[PDB]
Design a protein around this ligand. Structure first.
Ligand code: ATP
Ligand code: ATP
Ligand code: MG
Ligand code: MG
Ligand code: MN
Ligand code: MN
Ligand code: ZN
Ligand code: ZN
Lengths: 348, 356
DNA sequence: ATCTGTACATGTACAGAT
DNA sequence: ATCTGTACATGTACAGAT
DNA sequence: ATCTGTACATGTACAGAT
DNA sequence: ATCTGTACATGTACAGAT
């Protein structure tokens, strides 16, 4: 009852969707164009739209879009970086860049900034670089604020790295045929651009499965008909939206929650969808029970300090090395509070 | 129980499968290489294995393989033959390797199938390691059939197919009604695949005889057979086993046994059985309506349904609704009532023909 | 020297065999 | 319940062509 | 190698019927 | 309240033309 009303608030409006989309489409097409017919090191970069807006789980407003400019590359000798599972060195046009991640992303960002300087019909700037991010982020105002993440990615057509062999455990849910075919797709690398002052950080890329997460979001039933015109609606995505919203409201209020992002909710719910594969475990009439069991799952994750990357099982997103024990214990208290008092944070 | 044991008789043996496939693959490899030589008009033809053996529903013995030699053909052509839904003339706006087979702008099917059969006959002549000859042409068949003695008898239907990548012909807009069973996404993807035309090749005395082609969906049928469930894990190693294919096998076998004994059943063929079960899978989409424990009643309802098709003289092509495979124009009422009685008899006497 | 149609290499579902 | 042959989808090598 | 055309998936929006 | 049917909107895959 309450939760249906929250979801009506979170719904994007069809007019807001078309106004933001045509501006975003304008800038992205023009930037993609500058990469090609202009003989750059990125000639042949291709576009792949990723993230919440294209998965149809964007909440509140259409104000943040995610785009991959992916580039196919051949002699890619990979070499796992110090057992982290998700970070890698790359070895063997691009002779201008070991293939250095910062070196390559710098030229990518120089080109974009240049072309953004030559855009006279939209209010669009390049956000100052965030050490920690693989993105070049645009800030558009038309007039409302829209941020766009342009993510450079290497594309490799080889088999997936050893560290993912036990990942993507969809066999009881989406099945073994879906899994084998998914793993026949390419995989993608992106910059680790964090200034932790640590080791090989500057040449380290990171695995990306944004194309696989997109498929799963739109092929999310054990039944082929789930959420189709001739099937039965489930509420899996509405739980993602509600869990994503509770963390947006908690991050807006407390800076002690700065280390948490939507990807932590996303990974948590991928495990929940695998734990509870049956589409009837997600009946719209049980929206409350499902949201509450997801909350509980996410609290068990904070209590055990354990949230494994859905595709890279040995890479713990909640390790002491990324998030303080106290930050997790903090988030836990605020979730339990919202939980056990009917979610006051939703009414503001 | 009784039906558990028929399926064990019906089950193919790996030794037999291994020996038959070794031979069959060597022959098809050689015929395919020869298609690519010289000014062969069929250079660029590609292989696609279809039929019961590759759908895993081939029963009793591995002795009949079906394989398409498909050839891609562009432009935008096609004219439906007399509102039949299934049959077409193939034209060409472009006026070239198929030029030797045109008649004006109309591509002759029996001209192409002749040159196709000629080349196969030659290459089989020069095979001196396998006992393999070319079966005398059957009217109405698009196939060039090989008979291999292995020393066991083995049939191989080489089917000549045109491949078109355009949208499917409008006579199929309402066909393939899988939206409640396999879903709309599957339907959209399946219909983005090519469609195929094979020679009609009758000598009926009808106008356009040697230039009439017939639609074929063997490739979409292979997908459906191997992806037959509402649940993605159906019959997979972390999902539940169903009994959809086991019903098709038992029914193939009922018709196979009867067609051996009685000549009256010559108008009937396994495609009729296959078509009927696609309707039954559409009527009963849930995997739970095909539980292995209810194999008896699953086979029973398919029987009832096949009987209703025979008596009401109605069995629509799964992909071309307006095409009725059981129309009086195709099979006599006398032929349909005969099989109808033979089916009720088996159904209501403990299935004696299985013990044959 | 590079290009590339052909065929080998790789991985895994399906289902027979044990 | 595990071992295993066949089919098949896609990546990759390279003898022979350019 | 590039780009438009097509079809239908995913949505929002709403009125009528339940 | 919710289910259904139609209108309206964007995203995406791929055939075919240039
Ligand atoms: N830490 C990460 N590791 C791997 N992939 C990530 C990570 N963070 C983000 N991604 C990928 O990039 C996409 C965009 O991330 P972003 O931060 O915009 O979140 P989102 O899923 O788009 O949702 P929202 O923007 O609405 O919070 C994600 O959907 C995911 O595929
Ligand atoms: N009359 C027909 N109309 C349309 N397609 C047909 C027809 N007959 C056969 N086919 C197609 O060609 C394939 C091969 O036909 P075939 O007679 O070998 O049957 P099958 O399904 O392979 O089984 P089996 O050979 O074991 O009886 C079929 O699976 C079907 O896809
Ligand atoms: Mg986003
Ligand atoms: Mg066959
Ligand atoms: Mn982002
Ligand atoms: Mn046949
Ligand atoms: Zn759903
Ligand atoms: Zn099944």
């Amino acid at each position: 009852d309450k939760l249906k009303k929250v979801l009506d608030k979170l719904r994007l409006k069809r007019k807001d969707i078309s106004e933001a989309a045509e501006t975003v489409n304008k800038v992205v097409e023009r930037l993609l164009r500058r990469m090609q017919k202009r003989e750059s090191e990125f000639k042949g970069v291709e576009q792949l739209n990723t993230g919440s807006y294209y998965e149809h789980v964007k909440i509140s407003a259409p104000n943040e879009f995610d785009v991959m400019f992916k580039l196919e590359v051949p002699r890619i000798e990979l070499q796992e970086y110090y057992e982290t599972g998700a970070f890698y060195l790359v070895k063997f046009p691009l002779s201008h860049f070991v293939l250095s991640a910062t070196k390559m992303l710098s030229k990518f960002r120089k080109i974009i900034k240049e072309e953004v300087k030559e855009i006279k019909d939209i209010d669009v700037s390049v956000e100052k670089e965030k050490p920690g991010s693989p993105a070049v982020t645009l800030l558009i105002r038309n007039p409302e604020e829209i941020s766009v993440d342009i993510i450079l990615a290497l594309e490799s057509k080889g088999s997936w790295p050893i560290s993912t062999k036990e990942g993507l455990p969809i066999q009881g849910w989406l099945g073994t045929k879906v899994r084998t075919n998914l793993r026949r797709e390419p995989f993608y690398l992106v910059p680790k651009n964090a200034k932790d002052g640590n080791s090989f950080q500057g040449e380290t890329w990171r695995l990306s499965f944004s194309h696989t997460e997109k498929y799963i979001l739109n092929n999310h039933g054990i039944e082929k008909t789930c959420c189709e015109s001739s099937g039965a609606k489930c509420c899996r995505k509405e739980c993602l939206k509600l869990m994503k919203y509770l963390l947006e409201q908690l991050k807006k209020e407390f800076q002690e929650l700065d280390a948490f992002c939507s990807y932590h909710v996303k990974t948590a719910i991928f495990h929940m969808w695998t734990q509870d594969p049956q589409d009837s475990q997600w009946d719209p009439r049980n929206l409350s029970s499902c949201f509450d069991k997801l909350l509980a799952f996410f609290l068990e994750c904070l209590r055990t300090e354990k949230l494994d990357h859905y595709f890279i099982p040995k890479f713990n997103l909640f390790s002491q090395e990324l998030i303080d024990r106290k930050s997790k214990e903090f988030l836990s208290k605020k979730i339990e509070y919202e939980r056990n008092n009917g979610f006051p944070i939703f009414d503001k």
